[PDB]
Structure formats: structure tokens, C-alpha cells
Amino acid sequence: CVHHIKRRDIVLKWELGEGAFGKVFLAECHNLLDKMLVAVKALKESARQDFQREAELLTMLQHQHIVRFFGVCTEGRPLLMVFEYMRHGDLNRFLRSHGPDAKLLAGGEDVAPGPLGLGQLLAVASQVAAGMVYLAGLHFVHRDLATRNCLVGQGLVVKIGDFGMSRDIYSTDYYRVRTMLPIRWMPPESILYRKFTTESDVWSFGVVLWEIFTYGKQPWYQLSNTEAIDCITQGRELERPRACPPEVYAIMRGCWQREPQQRHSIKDVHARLQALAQAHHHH
Numbered sequence: 001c002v003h004h005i006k007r008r009d010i011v012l013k014w015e016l017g018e019g020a021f022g023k024v025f026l027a028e029c030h031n032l033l034d035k036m037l038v039a040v041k042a043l044k045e046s047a048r049q050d051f052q053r054e055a056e057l058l059t060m061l062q063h064q065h066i067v068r069f070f071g072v073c074t075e076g077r078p079l080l081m082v083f084e085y086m087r088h089g090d091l092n093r094f095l096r097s098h099g100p101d102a103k104l105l106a107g108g109e110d111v112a113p114g115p116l117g118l119g120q121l122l123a124v125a126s127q128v129a130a131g132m133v134y135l136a137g138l139h140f141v142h143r144d145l146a147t148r149n150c151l152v153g154q155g156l157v158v159k160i161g162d163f164g165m166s167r168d169i170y171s172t173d174y175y176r177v178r179t180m181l182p183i184r185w186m187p188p189e190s191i192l193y194r195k196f197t198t199e200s201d202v203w204s205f206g207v208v209l210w211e212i213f214t215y216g217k218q219p220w221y222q223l224s225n226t227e228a229i230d231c232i233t234q235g236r237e238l239e240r241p242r243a244c245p246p247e248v249y250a251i252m253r254g255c256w257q258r259e260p261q262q263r264h265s266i267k268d269v270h271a272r273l274q275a276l277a278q279a280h281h282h283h
């Protein structure tokens with residue numbers, strides 16, 4: 001069911017990054033019905049089994065807020081996976097680039113440098129929630145939802161992926177125990193017993209909300225991985241960000257209920273973020 005692309009149509013431009021399993025390139029692609037920019041993942045490695053499984057999954061996950069997969073290229077080696085190109089890169093760097101120090105960090109020609117406002121922060125939040133509502137419905141558990149696993153494209157379009165580049169670029173966001181876990185986004189049951197569910201993803205979503213309203217700060221930045229593990233298991237909650245309205249904090253607190261069945265459903269979270277976004281559109 002996977003779509004196939006001819007290797008002659010893929011025109012490599014430059015390596016964007018390197019994951020453990022592959023290399024990512026910025027490329028030019030002809031006929032995706034004509035010089036369209038794409039993100040091509042080239043497989044390093046048996047693994048031909050994993051490549052097929054992933055390609056079939058990516059072929060099935062099609063949504064407005066899920067990074068677009070356009071197909072594979074089995075004609076030769078390396079094996080290629082073609083995805084849409086999102087100009088603004090990962091959402092953590094984007095938030096960091098459009099925060100309190102945006103004027104200092106901006107290039108001469110950059111358009112209206114300055115922090116993103118409430119409406120924008122809410123527009124990003126609502127779109128991430130929408131992509132998570134889709135996954136929940138398909139009984140799909142992300143496991144690594146964080147701003148680094150989100151992409152931004154022109155016109156503040158925000159989409160969810162799961163990147164191997166994110167594990168490299170943001171290696172500090174993972175803890176070894178070899179399985180690298182994103183402990184700072186995980187609820188206690190996941191840290192304690194590796195219990196990943198839609199309810200652990202809604203917890204991660206609350207942590208993602210905190211990242212949006214702190215403009216990219218690391219959850220528990222003041223703490224070491226072991227101090228963060230004990231804070232999370234003890235039941236400590238992330239302090240309200242200064243840029244965070246109280247009602248948005250109530251949403252986070254909904255996502256962080258100690259018991260997984262007590263946590264707010266992603267649909268309710270989405271409906272509320274959309275309601276707030278809608279109430280600030282003209283003001």
C-alpha cells in the first residue's frame with residue numbers, strides 16, 4: 001500500500017542531520033502531483049523488515065497535524081523514505097527563536113522579531129492537541145511527544161512526527177536505563193514501570209504545553225536526571241510559566257492527575273485550547 005518514488009526524481013541538496021538508524025537530507029522532488037522540497041531519510045542498514053513495517057505505518061497515519069509521508073524508494077541502495085519539508089524546523093528551536101530574547105537572536109532581515117503572543121502560543125498548542133486527538137482515536141501511543149518531535153512550517157503550521165534527529169540533537173532530553181527514555185515528559189507509571197498509554201501521552205501533552213508557555217525551556221531544567229525522576233515520582237508539578245494564563249495552567253493540571261484514568265481526555269483538552277484560542281482571536 002506504500003507509494004514508490006523513482007530515484008531519478010529525488011535530488012539530494014544537503015544533509016540536515018543524522019539519526020542512529022539513518023541520515024536526513026533536504027532534497028528536490030519531481031512529480032508528487034514541479035520542484036517540491038522534501039525531507040529524505042536514508043537507511044543505514046534484517047532492517048529491510050523494520051523499513052517495510054515503518055513505511056506501512058507512515059502510509060496509514062495521514063492527518064492535517066501529522067508530518068506528511070510521501071512514500072519510499074526501494075530502487076537501489078540506500079533505502080529512502082520521503083517526507084514533507086517544514087521550513088522552520090523543530091518546534092523547540094522555533095519557540096527558543098521566538099521567545100523573550102527574539103530581537104537579540106534575530107538576523108537583520110527577520111520579520112517582526114519578538115516573542116510569540118498568547119494567540120500564537122494557543123494556536124501551536126491547539127494544533128499539537130489536534131494531532132494527538134487523531135492518534136488517540138486510532139489507539140496509537142506516541143511515547144515521545146515533546147516540542148522537539150514537532151515541526152513548524154510557514155504560516156505557523158505545527159505538525160507531529162517522531163524524529164531520530166531529535167534523539168541526537170536533543171540527546172540531553174533522554175536518560176539511559178540500552179533504552180533512552182524522555183523521563184522529563186513521562187508520568188510516574190512510565191518512569192517506574194514503562195507503562196505507555198494514551199493517558200501517558202496526555203501527560204506528555206501537558207509537559208509540551210509547559211514547553212510552549214516557557215518558550216522552549218527544559219522541564220525541570222534546574223535538576224539532574226535523578227533529581228527530576230524523584231520529583232516526578234513524588235508528585236511535584238512544574239511551576240506556572242510567567243507567559244502562562246491561569247486557565248492554560250488548569251489544562252496542564254488536568255493532564256497531570258496522578259492516576260492515568262483521572263487525566264483529562266485529549267479531546268477535552270483540545271476543545272478547551274480551541275475555545276480559548278477562539279476567545280482571543282479578535283483581542
Ligand SMILES: O=C(O)c1cc2c(-c3cccc4ccccc34)nccc2n1Cc1noc(-c2ccccc2)n1
Nearest residue numbers: 016019024039041067083089090161162163164165166
Ligand atoms: O531524523 C529523522 O527521522 C527525521 C527528521 C525529519 C525532518 C526534519 C527536517 C529538518 C529539520 C529537522 C530538525 C529536527 C527534527 C526533524 C527535522 N522532517 C521530516 C522527517 C524527518 N525525519 C524522518 C522521520 N522519522 O519519523 C518521521 C515521522 C513522520 C510522520 C509521523 C511519524 C514519524 N519522519
Ligand SMILES: [Cl-]
Nearest residue numbers: 246247249250
Ligand atoms: Cl491555575
